[PDB]
A paper describes a structure:
The integrated stress response (ISR) is a conserved eukaryotic stress response that senses and integrates diverse stressors and responds by reprogramming translation. Loading is catalyzed by the guanine nucleotide exchange factor (GEF) eIF2B, a large decameric and twofold symmetric enzyme that is composed of two copies each of five different subunits, eIF2Bα, β, δ, γ, and ε. The eIF2B decamer is built from two eIF2Bβδγε tetramers and one eIF2Bα2 homodimer. Upon ISR activation in response to a variety of stress conditions, eIF2 becomes phosphorylated, converting it from eIF2B’s substrate into an eIF2B inhibitor.
ISRIB’s mechanistic target is eIF2B to which it binds in a binding groove that centrally bridges the symmetry interface between eIF2Bβδγε tetramers. As such, it acts as a ‘molecular staple’, promoting assembly of two eIF2Bβδγε tetramers into an enzymatically active eIF2B(βδγε)2 octamer. (A) The distal portion of the original model eIF2Bα from the ISRIB-bound eIF2B decamer placed within EMDB:7443 after lowpass filtering to 3.0 Å resolution. There is a helix (amino acids 44–56) out of place. The average CC value for the chains belonging to eIF2Bα from this model is ~0.74. (B) After manual adjustments in Coot and re-refinement in phenix.real_space_refine, this short helix is placed inside the cryo-electron microscopy (EM) density with an average CC value for the chains belonging to eIF2Bα of ~0.77. Closer inspection revealed that ISRIB slightly draws the decamer's two halves together by comparison with the apostate but does not induce marked changes in eIF2B’s overall conformation. In the apo versus the ISRIB-bound state, eIF2Bδ L179 shifts slightly into the pocket, occupying a position where it would clash with ISRIB binding, and eIF2Bβ H188 (a key ISRIB interactor) adopts a different rotamer. Overall, however, we conclude that ISRIB binding to the eIF2B decamer correlates with slight rearrangements that are primarily confined to the ISRIB binding pocket. The A-State also contains a properly sized ISRIB binding pocket, thus rendering eIF2 and ISRIB binding synergistic.
Numbering used by the authors:
A (entry chain G): 4 to 79, 86 to 252, 270 to 305
B (entry chain J): 1 to 12, 21 to 134, 155 to 236, 239 to 243, 296 to 306
C (entry chain C): 8 to 98, 125 to 351
D (entry chain F): 166 to 522
E (entry chain B): 41 to 279, 285 to 466
The structure:
Amino acid sequence: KELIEYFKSQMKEDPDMASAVAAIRTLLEFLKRDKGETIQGLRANLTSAIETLCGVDSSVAVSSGGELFLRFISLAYSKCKKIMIERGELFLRRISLSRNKIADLCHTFIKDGATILTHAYSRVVLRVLEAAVAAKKRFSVYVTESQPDLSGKKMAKALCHLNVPVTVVLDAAVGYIMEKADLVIVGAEGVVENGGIINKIGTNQMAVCAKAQNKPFYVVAESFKFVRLFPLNQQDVPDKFKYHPWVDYTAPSLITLLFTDLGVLTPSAVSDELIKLYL
Amino acid sequence: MEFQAVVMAVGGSSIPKPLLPVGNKPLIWYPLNLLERVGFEEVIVVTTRDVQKALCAEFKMKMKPDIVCIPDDADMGTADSLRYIYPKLKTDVLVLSCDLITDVALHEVVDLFRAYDASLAMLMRKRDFIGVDSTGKRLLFMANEADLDEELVIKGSILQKHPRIRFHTGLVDAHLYCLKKYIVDFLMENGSITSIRSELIPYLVRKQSASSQSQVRCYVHIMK
Amino acid sequence: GSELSERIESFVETLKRGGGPRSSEEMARETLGLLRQIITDHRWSNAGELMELIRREGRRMTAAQPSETTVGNMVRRVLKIIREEYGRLHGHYAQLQSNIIEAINELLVELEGTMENIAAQALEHIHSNEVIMTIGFSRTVEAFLKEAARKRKFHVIVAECAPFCQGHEMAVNLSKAGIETTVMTDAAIFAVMSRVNKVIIGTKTILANGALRAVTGTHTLALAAKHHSTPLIVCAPMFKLSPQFPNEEDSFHKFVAPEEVLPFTEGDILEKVSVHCPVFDYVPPELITLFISNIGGNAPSYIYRLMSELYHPDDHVL
Amino acid sequence: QVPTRKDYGSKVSLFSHLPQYSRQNSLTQFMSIPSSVIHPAMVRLGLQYSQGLVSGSNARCIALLRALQQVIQDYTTPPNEELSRDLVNKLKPYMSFLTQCRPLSASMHNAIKFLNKEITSVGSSKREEEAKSELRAAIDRYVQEKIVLAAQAISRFAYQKISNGDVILVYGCSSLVSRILQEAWTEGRRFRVVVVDSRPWLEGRHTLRSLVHAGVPASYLLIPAASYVLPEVSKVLLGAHALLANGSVMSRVGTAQLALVARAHNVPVLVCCETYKFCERVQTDAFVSNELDDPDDLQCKRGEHVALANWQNHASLRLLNLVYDVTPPELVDLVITELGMIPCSSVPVVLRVKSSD
Amino acid sequence: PPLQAVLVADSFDRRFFPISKDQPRVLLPLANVALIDYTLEFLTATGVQETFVFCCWKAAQIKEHLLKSKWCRPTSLNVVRIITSELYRSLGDVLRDVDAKALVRSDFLLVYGDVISNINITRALEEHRLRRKLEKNVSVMTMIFKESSPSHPTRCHEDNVVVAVDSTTNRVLHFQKTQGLRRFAFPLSLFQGSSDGVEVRYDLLDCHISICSPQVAQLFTDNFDYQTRDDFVRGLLVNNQIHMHVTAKEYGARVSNLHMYSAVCADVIRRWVYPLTPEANFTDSTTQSCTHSRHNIYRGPEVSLGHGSILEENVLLGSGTVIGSNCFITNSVIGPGCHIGDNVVLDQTYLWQGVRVAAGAQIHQSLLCDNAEVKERVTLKPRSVLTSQVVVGPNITLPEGSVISLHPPDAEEDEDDGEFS
Ligand SMILES: O=C(COc1ccc(Cl)cc1)N[C@H]1CC[C@H](NC(=O)COc2ccc(Cl)cc2)CC1
């Protein structure tokens, strides 16, 4: 098609780039290229782009982005699209400053001399740890190897360049090392209404062990990851996002705080943001 | 005004209730005092005239604040009375009539009429076969035996609805009824039926121009 | 001869049809008397044949009513007594029988003292102006409370058991002695639990895991007590101890006619709805704080040692 | 003036601040038959409430709104007075009579608050009759949306949550839960519902009859046996009577117990409620604010020996049946409203959004 | 004084066509258990010490079946007296034979041999004795009813009865059956007979556990035209008087027709007749002991459930049964020694002993009696009966009302194969 290969090469373009940002870029250029001047026909092309892009990629982050920014642009007839492209550009700018804001709000929560415990590789956790070490903070790091795709080794390699002691641990050894970790920081792949996070398979184990040892469980995520889902148990999550599952759900009961570009939030506040945004 | 009370003065072997026999206070004085005791600042009374107008003249001497005593024809009854006074009533009716020497705390029958939004509520105390349900409040079956050419009538449908019916034989009604406005509508629209006391039995509580309004429930109170 | 046979039968059918005798202490007394009469009125010379016939008749009893575990566990007690006597005399036939009889006699005389023992022990567990909660009816627990009431003032909250509201007569019995008693529906257990100090309840059977089989709804009360961290006390004599384990068994709950739960007069819906009336229910040992017995208080984590002290491990299957 | 109802029976010490009333001893036996102090419709509704003929929260609120329509319709402004203040002043004795017949529910409180707000918002310059029927139309619109449209929206939101071949546990009578299950079965879902009931009201038979009439497979058991059936249950659905500012669920007495046992059994708990039943009030227990029904209802008719027959003749005997209880917000997972699915943490946020803020 | 009873083991009203023709009605297994066994269990549980089993039709079979039963063991506390005669053809004949031979002495339990009940009538019996002691033994019978609803399946329109009683003395003043009647009549002088409150009751299910004085037998011999109980009641109430006892918390019903059979079976499986439940094994048998699982699944011994076979609710499986895989059994009783094929859907079907069902069969609300057989791809509509070693061929779908047997004049089929005529 036209969006499949552009998304693929955007992944190739910037190996240091997220997937939701690539998705919003692809949908922006898709809407800017075809020149769809129709009140109702524009939405058809939009949802076609969204369904195609989360058919190629099974991320909840991509679908959440899609939904929220398609509503944002639709919330903006000839002048409609003329102002909608403006609002899309400024949305892209805000989403770009997202991760820097996230690092520079949450790097102050890591008391130095502590021990970070992290799940598989995530760009937001890496950014906040870079911000912390740039502020002259020394700490030890344990990383889960992320057995399905060995992203723990990748996280350890990326964090070793930051001049910090990183000790990638086994997937099932968090229960052993949880008493040696002062806190847990994990980058959510998607945030459900109640405050839970639909992250990699072992994040739920992380949170359960944290509640078993009262250890703080911190989560960092961009606000374009706020998805309007409410799973009651593991099976209640959409099966498309699970594909041996790949991504499981963690209740807000197990999360202490969320560090988003909208400031530090109680797991209770994300639902407030979502119902203010009205899906 | 919730209720617009009315007292009939026409009888319906021993005693002409309208005029003559008075132990201590005129025969209608007891109904009038019962009414005025519980509110009822306005009262409508129907005056006989087959007496050659010897009733209304002496019933305005009871020192009551204000009452309405409407004259009657040369000869009529109680359903005739209600049809005559229909144009001057606009709300629910509380029908009494002259021969009422009673103790009744009518709060009970009026509460029965209110709570269950009854089409009709009645008062009785121990040849009229009256059958009530287990609670004894709702009127299931009622029939005299002067009416009853055949042995005894009871529908299978009402027994399927209400399985057990408690029956009584020696029940005497106090003629104290609380009529809806639409029951008086039905009465006026059908001059067929006279003798209100006999009009209570064509209640047709069960589904058959006859329902001027849904249910037409009826209720009973049995005194101490 | 045939007197023994017809009495054994009578007892079997009484256990099968209804509850006779009502009190399970009287049931223990009756079954012990019957076991004595069996061991006396049979032509047994070796202890093995006696143990075998005892096991057979105990199997018949257990098949009569599985939910009534007192009979079975006391049969196991008699078997352990026989084993102990045989070990004493072998580690001797008439002396064997008479020694078994005097062992049964001491078991019986200590059987009627468990009530008084628990009643005496009751005082050191209740303080003034305390709020007790109990569910259903239990002779042991009401004796406990009315013995503590002679020297202490306290409040008892009795949760009636639906459908069999035995808790009402328990509340009346407690009020007889001036024990300020509040009666409530079992639905209000968690609502009132926040203002309760202790939970004291009887039981029908204590399992080897420490869990106990008690009247339905008591598991919810135990969960509420655990949520509010209030101590849950079980005043159960040592003849309700059953060596069987929770899920190695069969026929745990006793289901009675659903007429108790939903009446016949409801009509046609009774052909479309499935009604269930479990009398007993399972309470795991994690929700019990302390067991009170005729010997003294014990944690649920010692009931297995009490088993080892009462029942031979090869007789747990009968 | 309306006399005060005598508090029947012996109250539990912890509930001495709440009133306890008897169903037999009503309140209208000291009132004029052609009632003048209290409007006929209002005394009618109070008598219906006291006898227990109107039970459901939605039913109570709707009956209240209809009685209020009948009142304002028959209301006439006295000379040299304005409707705005006179009507809201005259409505207070009626509300006091109601709360004396039976304590007001959260839905009733919110409805009366909204009605007073609308009445005070009626223009001074406006005439009488169009103001009256404007109030009537506003009440019609309010009840219409907040009841039927809220019910339809919540039914759709719950239908997109119920899956095929799952066991749902319900407690007591609730119009919203019954409608949700009926609509889910009609739409195509194939499930079975376990109905849990409790003494003495036995209101579960209502939803049981409703489900059987709708054809849904149903099972029935009383609340003590809930621990036995929850292993089979896939989900717990409940109907809230009130949702407080802290997210706690103020509903029938057996709701918090069921939520606790379900949490113990890893069964997610869902509560269905509308926004008009949200209350800025808050409580932490069933003791600060509750309602005590007639204790004579506890007496069980076990054939020939009613044990609690003469319970008043026993000095140290107390009877108590609580009508409400509170579930802490951490024992509940979902709250399904017009706005969709929300956590109990987000109840006060919805309150703010519905405060025209 | 001791308590006797009369057990009419022959339902003289010829109803079960042709199920009675093969074995007597009282021997029909309700749930792997004969009805007479249920009646004997009830009689020995309520406290009867001596019964009189009057068997007329197929008397040899009934006697042979009862002699091996528990109630004929020397250790049994309930003594039975099987009585033999091809002459009497009615309940009235049985009772006049009783008074001629002078069996009963006082307050004997009159009951048929096809009653399922658990009522403890000690209360009713002492009420009857008190009434007879106070009022000069003029009360001759106490009819025992159960509180019901007009909508309950166990109240069939054939046996539906309406009574007019005295709410004070509970004496029965009027009694009749409402079979096919949209109109009920109650004579005037009912109110003259008892002046302190007449009450009409239609919620009463007739348990047929009438406990009667010997005067009842004297009357039955004083009126030769009296044939059955209903006629006796009608003839006595129009002219000694009859009284009543109403039960609320105990079950009772007689299996008159197939509808009553199905209703009572469904009630028994769902423990409405506790303690008379399949798990209890009230009869001291070896092949009739089951393990009551959840949802009233009485999974017996060696039933050999298939892979994925589903037992939804209220399912009884006789021992020695064999069930294929991917089956769906719901609210159905399966007799002992039955083979079920694969993908078989059974709904409210009472498969008796020896029934063999091939794969793909869809049976709903049917009744396959002993040794019945159905071939592959066979569908049965509700209220269809197969009887005594009859075979239904493949690719056949029976209509709703279809009785198949080996008796031509008594079925829609004959000795030929069920494949085609
Ligand atoms: O009156 C009652 C009855 O309680 C109930 C009755 C019925 C129900 Cl439904 C629920 C509870 N209970 C008492 C129990 C002592 C308490 N507290 C005190 O008397 C003082 O408590 C103290 C004082 C000092 C210390 Cl260090 C600790 C507690 C008052 C209430």
